[PDB]
């Protein structure tokens, strides 16, 4: 996260860390959507251009963390994966279209003051909240600049109109993505950056006071560059696929 700040304790209880067993390294962020289901970006697990193709056994999911490196005894819980589900039409060849994946945990995780799931939006919530100008919140342990932070970082960013997102890049953008960030003259800055992938972009509903996950950190070109924006997977647009997987498995 660029231009963010240290998160408060328990501020993002659905935040999950995708950790590689060997070598031990932070692969991506992710989010807890239930006692046994984790949501992340499909490219965190499969990306042929960089020779990335992880299997269940190559990963660990750490939940309830704040410090990036420390093993938080009595606070964080570690789970192993039973199965990974990548969207069948995830487009790694061109623009990371449908960059979404579900991960089923071996055993349900017990909730605590530091571990609690986020809500997935419904058509109504998606419609009323996903509008240009409205701010969401992104969290992660990724790069602080285009090194890494000691604890979870947070940054609030405004959703940008689709035309503006399209005209800022040469990449073909789809209905399954949205972009966020401040424009060059707005005076404020901030962005997600490498290491933040898979993390949640959330918004707090003013109707029922709940936090909903509207996006997944997907991609960008550089970090916090003027006239450039971060791109996120549109969670609601892919909710049908999400439900289908959870119902079948």
């Amino acid at each position: 996260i660029v231009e963010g700040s240290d998160a408060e304790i328990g501020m993002s209880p659905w935040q999950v860390m995708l950790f590689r067993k060997s070598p031990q390294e932070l692969l991506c962020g992710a989010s807890l959507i239930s006692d046994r289901w984790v949501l992340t970006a499909a490219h965190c697990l499969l990306y042929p251009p960089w020779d990335k193709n992880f299997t269940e056994n190559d990963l660990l999911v750490r939940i309830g963390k704040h410090s990036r490196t420390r093993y938080e005894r009595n606070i964080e819980k570690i789970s192993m994966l039973e199965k990974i589900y990548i969207h069948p039409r995830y487009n790694w060849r061109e623009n990371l279209d449908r960059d979404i994946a579900l991960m089923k945990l071996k055993k349900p995780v017990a909730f605590s003051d530091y571990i609690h799931p986020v809500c997935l939006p419904d058509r109504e919530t998606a419609a009323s909240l996903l509008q240009a100008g409205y701010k969401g919140r992104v969290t992660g342990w990724g790069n602080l600049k285009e090194g890494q932070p000691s604890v979870l970082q947070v940054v609030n960013l405004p959703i940008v109109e689709r035309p503006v997102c399209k005209d800022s890049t040469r990449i073909r953008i789809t209905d399954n993505m949205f972009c966020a960030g401040y424009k060059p003259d707005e005076g404020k800055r901030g962005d997600a950056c490498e290491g933040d992938s898979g993390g949640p972009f959330v918004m707090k509903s003013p109707f029922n006071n709940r936090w909903y996950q509207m996006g997944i950190v997907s991609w960008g070109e550089g970090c916090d560059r003027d006239g450039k924006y971060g791109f996120y997977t549109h969670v609601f647009r892919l909710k049908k696929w999400i439900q289908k997987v959870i119902d079948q498995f």
Partner: peptide
Amino acid sequence: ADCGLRPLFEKKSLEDKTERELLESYI
């Protein structure tokens, strides 16, 4: 069911340092 309600904030009626910025943008 209890999704999106944080034990240390919503459940105690305590708000975090920047959540107001989000609500203030939902005009």
